[PDB]
Amino acid sequence: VVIEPITNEDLTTKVVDGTGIFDELMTAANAHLSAQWDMERITGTQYAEVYLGQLTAVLQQAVTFLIEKDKTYLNNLLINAQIELANKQIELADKELEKAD
Amino acid sequence: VVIEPITNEDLTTKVVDGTGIFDELMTAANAHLSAQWDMERITGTQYAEVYLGQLTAVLQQAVTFLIEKDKTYLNNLLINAQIELANKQIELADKELEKAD
């Protein structure tokens, strides 16, 4: 696999509909907000109050996800490799039992 | 097993009925909310107030589950392999007792 560097443009594109992770999380939260607002359930003021109220915790979640995405994928690959190595060690344990008799 | 990379599209699809984990958790919470609301127990304003009030903690739970799902599965597989290796070591301990006599 080819790992890519974590740059500033992977978190925020500095645009509302950006391609970053924080921008995508904002777009996803705004999707639910718009779905609720299209049913005259919230006024524009409450729409902006809720949308802007999550500007500082969704950022935390986006940062946490960005830091622990590729690391998690690589760790899963390493765990799979270790499982294969454990199967090989089981086979070697069978051979060890034979050379023991 | 084939491990898949953890991408942005696995958390949020940026749609209300998305295929991500956060989107599925929102759909599940909305299912209970709709079940309660179909019995005239909550007004639309309270429906949106409760639905939007969990937009920042359900995100935390979705992130935690997404990070620790494949890792947990691989760890369980490794634990099973270690249990098999422990059984093999018990057999080798029996052989060790024999070559001891």
Short mmCIF file of N, CA, C and O in Angstrom, two decimals, chain A:
data_model
loop_
_atom_site.label_atom_id
_atom_site.label_comp_id
_atom_site.label_asym_id
_atom_site.label_seq_id
_atom_site.Cartn_x
_atom_site.Cartn_y
_atom_site.Cartn_z
N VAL A 1 0.83 -1.20 0.00
CA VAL A 1 0.00 0.00 0.00
C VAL A 1 0.87 1.25 0.00
O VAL A 1 2.01 1.23 0.47
N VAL A 2 0.33 2.34 -0.53
CA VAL A 2 1.02 3.62 -0.60
C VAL A 2 0.38 4.54 0.43
O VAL A 2 -0.79 4.92 0.29
N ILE A 3 1.14 4.91 1.46
CA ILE A 3 0.65 5.82 2.49
C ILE A 3 0.91 7.25 2.02
O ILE A 3 1.94 7.53 1.41
N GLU A 4 -0.04 8.14 2.28
CA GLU A 4 0.12 9.52 1.88
C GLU A 4 0.37 10.40 3.10
O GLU A 4 -0.13 10.12 4.19
N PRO A 5 1.14 11.48 2.94
CA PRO A 5 1.39 12.37 4.07
C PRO A 5 0.12 13.08 4.51
O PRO A 5 -0.77 13.37 3.70
N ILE A 6 0.04 13.36 5.80
CA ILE A 6 -1.09 14.08 6.37
C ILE A 6 -0.76 15.57 6.30
O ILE A 6 0.10 16.06 7.03
N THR A 7 -1.44 16.28 5.41
CA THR A 7 -1.22 17.70 5.19
C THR A 7 -2.40 18.51 5.73
O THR A 7 -3.42 17.96 6.15
N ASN A 8 -2.22 19.83 5.72
CA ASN A 8 -3.28 20.72 6.18
C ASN A 8 -4.53 20.61 5.32
O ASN A 8 -5.65 20.75 5.82
N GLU A 9 -4.35 20.35 4.02
CA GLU A 9 -5.47 20.26 3.09
C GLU A 9 -6.31 19.00 3.29
O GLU A 9 -7.38 18.89 2.68
N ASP A 10 -5.85 18.05 4.10
CA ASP A 10 -6.65 16.87 4.40
C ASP A 10 -7.62 17.08 5.56
O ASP A 10 -8.55 16.29 5.72
N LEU A 11 -7.42 18.13 6.35
CA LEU A 11 -8.35 18.47 7.43
C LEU A 11 -9.36 19.52 6.99
O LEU A 11 -10.57 19.28 7.04
N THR A 12 -8.89 20.68 6.55
CA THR A 12 -9.74 21.78 6.13
C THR A 12 -9.27 22.29 4.78
O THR A 12 -8.07 22.55 4.59
N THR A 13 -10.20 22.44 3.84
CA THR A 13 -9.92 23.08 2.57
C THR A 13 -10.19 24.58 2.61
O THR A 13 -10.05 25.25 1.58
N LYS A 14 -10.56 25.11 3.77
CA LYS A 14 -10.88 26.53 3.97
C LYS A 14 -12.07 26.98 3.14
O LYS A 14 -12.22 28.17 2.85
N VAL A 15 -12.92 26.04 2.74
CA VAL A 15 -14.17 26.33 2.04
C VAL A 15 -15.28 25.59 2.77
O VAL A 15 -15.04 24.56 3.42
N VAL A 16 -16.50 26.12 2.69
CA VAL A 16 -17.62 25.51 3.39
C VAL A 16 -17.89 24.10 2.88
O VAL A 16 -18.06 23.16 3.66
N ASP A 17 -17.93 23.93 1.56
CA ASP A 17 -18.06 22.60 0.95
C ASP A 17 -16.70 22.04 0.57
O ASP A 17 -16.46 21.63 -0.57
N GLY A 18 -15.77 22.00 1.53
CA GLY A 18 -14.43 21.54 1.25
C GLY A 18 -14.33 20.03 1.17
O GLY A 18 -15.25 19.29 1.51
N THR A 19 -13.17 19.58 0.71
CA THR A 19 -12.88 18.16 0.55
C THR A 19 -12.19 17.55 1.76
O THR A 19 -11.85 16.36 1.73
N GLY A 20 -11.95 18.32 2.81
CA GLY A 20 -11.30 17.81 4.00
C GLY A 20 -12.23 16.96 4.84
O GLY A 20 -13.40 16.74 4.52
N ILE A 21 -11.69 16.48 5.96
CA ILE A 21 -12.49 15.65 6.85
C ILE A 21 -13.41 16.51 7.71
O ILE A 21 -14.58 16.18 7.91
N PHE A 22 -12.90 17.63 8.23
CA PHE A 22 -13.75 18.54 8.99
C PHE A 22 -14.83 19.13 8.10
O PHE A 22 -15.99 19.27 8.53
N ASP A 23 -14.49 19.48 6.86
CA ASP A 23 -15.48 20.01 5.93
C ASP A 23 -16.55 18.97 5.61
O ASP A 23 -17.74 19.30 5.55
N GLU A 24 -16.15 17.72 5.41
CA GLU A 24 -17.12 16.67 5.14
C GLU A 24 -18.01 16.42 6.35
O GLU A 24 -19.21 16.16 6.20
N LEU A 25 -17.45 16.48 7.56
CA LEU A 25 -18.26 16.31 8.76
C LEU A 25 -19.26 17.46 8.91
O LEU A 25 -20.42 17.24 9.29
N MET A 26 -18.83 18.69 8.60
CA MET A 26 -19.76 19.81 8.60
C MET A 26 -20.87 19.61 7.57
O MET A 26 -22.03 19.90 7.85
N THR A 27 -20.51 19.14 6.37
CA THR A 27 -21.53 18.88 5.35
C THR A 27 -22.51 17.81 5.80
O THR A 27 -23.71 17.91 5.52
N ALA A 28 -22.02 16.77 6.48
CA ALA A 28 -22.89 15.71 6.96
C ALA A 28 -23.83 16.20 8.06
O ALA A 28 -25.01 15.84 8.05
N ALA A 29 -23.32 16.98 9.01
CA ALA A 29 -24.19 17.54 10.04
C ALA A 29 -25.20 18.50 9.44
O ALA A 29 -26.38 18.50 9.82
N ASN A 30 -24.77 19.32 8.49
CA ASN A 30 -25.66 20.23 7.78
C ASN A 30 -26.71 19.47 6.98
O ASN A 30 -27.81 19.99 6.79
N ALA A 31 -26.41 18.25 6.52
CA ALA A 31 -27.42 17.47 5.82
C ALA A 31 -28.58 17.11 6.75
O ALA A 31 -29.75 17.27 6.38
N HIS A 32 -28.27 16.65 7.96
CA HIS A 32 -29.33 16.37 8.93
C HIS A 32 -30.06 17.64 9.33
O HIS A 32 -31.29 17.64 9.47
N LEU A 33 -29.32 18.73 9.52
CA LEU A 33 -29.95 20.00 9.87
C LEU A 33 -30.91 20.46 8.78
O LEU A 33 -32.02 20.91 9.08
N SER A 34 -30.50 20.34 7.52
CA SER A 34 -31.37 20.72 6.41
C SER A 34 -32.57 19.79 6.29
O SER A 34 -33.67 20.24 5.96
N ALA A 35 -32.37 18.49 6.55
CA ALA A 35 -33.50 17.56 6.52
C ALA A 35 -34.54 17.93 7.56
O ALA A 35 -35.75 17.90 7.28
N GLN A 36 -34.10 18.28 8.77
CA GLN A 36 -35.04 18.72 9.79
C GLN A 36 -35.66 20.07 9.44
O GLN A 36 -36.86 20.28 9.67
N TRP A 37 -34.87 20.98 8.88
CA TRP A 37 -35.35 22.34 8.62
C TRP A 37 -36.32 22.38 7.45
O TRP A 37 -37.18 23.28 7.40
N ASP A 38 -36.22 21.44 6.52
CA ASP A 38 -37.15 21.38 5.40
C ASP A 38 -38.56 20.99 5.82
O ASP A 38 -39.48 21.10 5.00
N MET A 39 -38.72 20.62 7.09
CA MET A 39 -40.06 20.28 7.63
C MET A 39 -40.49 21.37 8.63
O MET A 39 -41.19 21.02 9.60
N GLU A 40 -40.07 22.61 8.41
CA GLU A 40 -40.49 23.74 9.28
C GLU A 40 -40.43 23.36 10.76
O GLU A 40 -41.33 23.78 11.51
N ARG A 41 -39.42 22.59 11.16
CA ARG A 41 -39.24 22.24 12.56
C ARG A 41 -38.32 23.18 13.32
O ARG A 41 -38.40 23.23 14.55
N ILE A 42 -37.45 23.91 12.63
CA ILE A 42 -36.53 24.85 13.25
C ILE A 42 -36.48 26.11 12.42
O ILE A 42 -36.56 26.06 11.18
N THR A 43 -36.36 27.26 13.09
CA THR A 43 -36.21 28.52 12.40
C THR A 43 -34.76 28.71 11.95
O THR A 43 -33.86 27.97 12.35
N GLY A 44 -34.55 29.72 11.10
CA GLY A 44 -33.21 30.00 10.62
C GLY A 44 -32.25 30.34 11.74
O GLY A 44 -31.08 29.93 11.72
N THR A 45 -32.72 31.09 12.74
CA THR A 45 -31.86 31.44 13.87
C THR A 45 -31.42 30.20 14.63
O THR A 45 -30.24 30.05 14.96
N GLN A 46 -32.35 29.28 14.90
CA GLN A 46 -31.98 28.04 15.56
C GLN A 46 -31.12 27.16 14.67
O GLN A 46 -30.23 26.46 15.16
N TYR A 47 -31.38 27.18 13.35
CA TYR A 47 -30.54 26.45 12.41
C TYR A 47 -29.09 26.90 12.53
O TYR A 47 -28.18 26.07 12.67
N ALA A 48 -28.84 28.21 12.49
CA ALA A 48 -27.49 28.73 12.64
C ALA A 48 -26.93 28.54 14.04
O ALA A 48 -25.71 28.36 14.18
N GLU A 49 -27.77 28.58 15.07
CA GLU A 49 -27.30 28.38 16.43
C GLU A 49 -26.83 26.96 16.67
O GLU A 49 -25.81 26.75 17.34
N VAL A 50 -27.54 25.97 16.13
CA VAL A 50 -27.12 24.58 16.25
C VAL A 50 -25.94 24.28 15.33
O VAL A 50 -25.00 23.59 15.73
N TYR A 51 -25.97 24.80 14.10
CA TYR A 51 -24.89 24.55 13.16
C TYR A 51 -23.57 25.13 13.66
O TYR A 51 -22.52 24.48 13.57
N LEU A 52 -23.60 26.35 14.19
CA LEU A 52 -22.39 26.98 14.70
C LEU A 52 -22.00 26.49 16.08
O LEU A 52 -20.86 26.70 16.50
N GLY A 53 -22.92 25.85 16.81
CA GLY A 53 -22.59 25.33 18.13
C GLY A 53 -21.74 24.09 18.12
O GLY A 53 -21.11 23.78 19.13
N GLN A 54 -21.72 23.36 17.00
CA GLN A 54 -20.91 22.16 16.86
C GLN A 54 -19.61 22.43 16.10
O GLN A 54 -18.91 21.48 15.74
N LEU A 55 -19.28 23.70 15.87
CA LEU A 55 -18.08 24.04 15.11
C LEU A 55 -16.80 23.70 15.86
O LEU A 55 -15.73 23.70 15.25
N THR A 56 -16.88 23.41 17.16
CA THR A 56 -15.69 23.19 17.98
C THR A 56 -15.56 21.77 18.50
O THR A 56 -14.47 21.40 18.94
N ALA A 57 -16.63 20.98 18.48
CA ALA A 57 -16.54 19.57 18.86
C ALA A 57 -16.43 18.66 17.65
O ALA A 57 -15.71 17.65 17.69
N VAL A 58 -17.13 18.99 16.57
CA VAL A 58 -16.96 18.26 15.32
C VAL A 58 -15.53 18.41 14.81
O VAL A 58 -14.98 17.50 14.20
N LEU A 59 -14.91 19.56 15.08
CA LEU A 59 -13.49 19.72 14.77
C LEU A 59 -12.65 18.71 15.55
O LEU A 59 -11.72 18.11 14.99
N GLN A 60 -12.96 18.52 16.83
CA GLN A 60 -12.23 17.55 17.64
C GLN A 60 -12.40 16.14 17.08
O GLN A 60 -11.42 15.39 16.96
N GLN A 61 -13.63 15.77 16.73
CA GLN A 61 -13.86 14.44 16.16
C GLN A 61 -13.16 14.27 14.82
O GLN A 61 -12.62 13.20 14.54
N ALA A 62 -13.17 15.31 13.98
CA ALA A 62 -12.49 15.23 12.69
C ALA A 62 -10.99 15.07 12.88
O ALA A 62 -10.36 14.28 12.16
N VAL A 63 -10.40 15.80 13.83
CA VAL A 63 -8.98 15.64 14.10
C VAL A 63 -8.67 14.23 14.58
O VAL A 63 -7.73 13.59 14.11
N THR A 64 -9.48 13.72 15.52
CA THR A 64 -9.25 12.37 16.03
C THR A 64 -9.35 11.33 14.93
O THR A 64 -8.53 10.41 14.85
N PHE A 65 -10.35 11.46 14.05
CA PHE A 65 -10.50 10.51 12.95
C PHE A 65 -9.35 10.63 11.96
O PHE A 65 -8.85 9.61 11.46
N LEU A 66 -8.91 11.85 11.65
CA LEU A 66 -7.83 12.04 10.69
C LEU A 66 -6.53 11.45 11.20
O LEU A 66 -5.79 10.82 10.44
N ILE A 67 -6.22 11.65 12.48
CA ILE A 67 -4.99 11.10 13.04
C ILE A 67 -5.02 9.57 13.08
O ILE A 67 -3.99 8.94 12.83
N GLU A 68 -6.16 8.97 13.38
CA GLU A 68 -6.24 7.53 13.63
C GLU A 68 -6.94 6.76 12.52
O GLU A 68 -7.60 5.75 12.79
N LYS A 69 -6.83 7.22 11.27
CA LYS A 69 -7.41 6.46 10.16
C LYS A 69 -6.36 5.57 9.50
O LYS A 69 -6.49 4.33 9.50
N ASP A 70 -5.31 6.18 8.95
CA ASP A 70 -4.26 5.40 8.30
C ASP A 70 -3.51 4.55 9.31
O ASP A 70 -3.12 3.41 9.00
N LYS A 71 -3.30 5.07 10.52
CA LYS A 71 -2.67 4.28 11.57
C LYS A 71 -3.49 3.04 11.88
O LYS A 71 -2.94 1.94 12.03
N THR A 72 -4.81 3.19 11.97
CA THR A 72 -5.67 2.04 12.23
C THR A 72 -5.61 1.03 11.09
O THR A 72 -5.56 -0.18 11.32
N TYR A 73 -5.63 1.51 9.84
CA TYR A 73 -5.55 0.60 8.70
C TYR A 73 -4.25 -0.19 8.71
O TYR A 73 -4.24 -1.42 8.53
N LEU A 74 -3.12 0.50 8.93
CA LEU A 74 -1.83 -0.18 8.96
C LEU A 74 -1.74 -1.15 10.13
O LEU A 74 -1.17 -2.24 10.00
N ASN A 75 -2.30 -0.77 11.28
CA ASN A 75 -2.30 -1.68 12.42
C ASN A 75 -3.13 -2.93 12.13
O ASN A 75 -2.75 -4.03 12.53
N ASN A 76 -4.26 -2.77 11.44
CA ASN A 76 -5.05 -3.94 11.07
C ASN A 76 -4.28 -4.85 10.12
O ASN A 76 -4.32 -6.08 10.26
N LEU A 77 -3.56 -4.26 9.16
CA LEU A 77 -2.74 -5.07 8.27
C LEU A 77 -1.66 -5.82 9.04
O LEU A 77 -1.41 -7.01 8.80
N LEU A 78 -1.02 -5.14 9.99
CA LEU A 78 0.00 -5.80 10.81
C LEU A 78 -0.60 -6.92 11.65
O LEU A 78 0.03 -7.96 11.84
N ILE A 79 -1.81 -6.72 12.17
CA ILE A 79 -2.46 -7.76 12.95
C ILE A 79 -2.76 -8.97 12.08
O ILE A 79 -2.61 -10.12 12.51
N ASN A 80 -3.19 -8.74 10.84
CA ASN A 80 -3.40 -9.85 9.92
C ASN A 80 -2.10 -10.61 9.66
O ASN A 80 -2.08 -11.85 9.64
N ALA A 81 -1.00 -9.87 9.47
CA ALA A 81 0.29 -10.52 9.29
C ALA A 81 0.68 -11.35 10.51
O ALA A 81 1.21 -12.45 10.38
N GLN A 82 0.42 -10.82 11.71
CA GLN A 82 0.73 -11.56 12.93
C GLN A 82 -0.13 -12.81 13.05
O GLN A 82 0.33 -13.83 13.57
N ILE A 83 -1.38 -12.75 12.60
CA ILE A 83 -2.23 -13.94 12.62
C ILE A 83 -1.66 -15.01 11.69
O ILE A 83 -1.62 -16.20 12.03
N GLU A 84 -1.22 -14.60 10.50
CA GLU A 84 -0.59 -15.55 9.59
C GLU A 84 0.67 -16.15 10.21
O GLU A 84 0.91 -17.36 10.11
N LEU A 85 1.48 -15.31 10.86
CA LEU A 85 2.68 -15.80 11.53
C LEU A 85 2.33 -16.77 12.65
O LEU A 85 3.06 -17.73 12.90
N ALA A 86 1.23 -16.52 13.36
CA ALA A 86 0.79 -17.43 14.41
C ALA A 86 0.38 -18.78 13.83
O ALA A 86 0.67 -19.83 14.43
N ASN A 87 -0.30 -18.78 12.68
CA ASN A 87 -0.60 -20.05 12.03
C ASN A 87 0.67 -20.79 11.64
O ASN A 87 0.78 -22.02 11.83
N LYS A 88 1.66 -20.06 11.12
CA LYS A 88 2.94 -20.69 10.80
C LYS A 88 3.61 -21.26 12.04
O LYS A 88 4.20 -22.35 12.00
N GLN A 89 3.52 -20.55 13.17
CA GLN A 89 4.10 -21.05 14.41
C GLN A 89 3.35 -22.28 14.92
O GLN A 89 3.95 -23.14 15.55
N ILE A 90 2.05 -22.37 14.66
CA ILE A 90 1.31 -23.58 15.01
C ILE A 90 1.82 -24.76 14.19
O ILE A 90 2.01 -25.87 14.72
N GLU A 91 2.05 -24.55 12.90
CA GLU A 91 2.62 -25.61 12.07
C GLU A 91 4.00 -26.02 12.57
O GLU A 91 4.33 -27.21 12.65
N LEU A 92 4.83 -25.03 12.93
CA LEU A 92 6.14 -25.33 13.50
C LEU A 92 6.03 -26.04 14.84
O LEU A 92 6.91 -26.84 15.17
N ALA A 93 4.98 -25.78 15.61
CA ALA A 93 4.76 -26.51 16.86
C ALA A 93 4.43 -27.97 16.58
O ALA A 93 4.86 -28.86 17.32
N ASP A 94 3.65 -28.23 15.53
CA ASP A 94 3.41 -29.62 15.13
C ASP A 94 4.72 -30.31 14.74
O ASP A 94 4.98 -31.45 15.15
N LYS A 95 5.56 -29.62 13.96
CA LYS A 95 6.86 -30.19 13.62
C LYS A 95 7.71 -30.41 14.86
O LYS A 95 8.45 -31.40 14.96
N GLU A 96 7.63 -29.50 15.83
CA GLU A 96 8.35 -29.64 17.08
C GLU A 96 7.88 -30.86 17.85
O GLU A 96 8.68 -31.56 18.47
N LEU A 97 6.57 -31.12 17.84
CA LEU A 97 6.05 -32.33 18.49
C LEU A 97 6.60 -33.58 17.82
O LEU A 97 6.98 -34.55 18.50
N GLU A 98 6.64 -33.59 16.48
CA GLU A 98 7.20 -34.75 15.78
C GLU A 98 8.67 -34.96 16.15
O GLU A 98 9.09 -36.09 16.47
N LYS A 99 9.49 -33.92 16.08
CA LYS A 99 10.93 -34.17 16.35
C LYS A 99 11.11 -34.48 17.85
O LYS A 99 12.21 -34.86 18.25
N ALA A 100 10.04 -34.32 18.63
CA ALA A 100 10.13 -34.64 20.07
C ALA A 100 10.00 -36.15 20.26
O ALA A 100 10.86 -36.75 20.92
N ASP A 101 8.97 -36.75 19.67
CA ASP A 101 8.84 -38.22 19.75
C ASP A 101 10.21 -38.81 19.45
O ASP A 101 10.65 -39.68 20.22
#
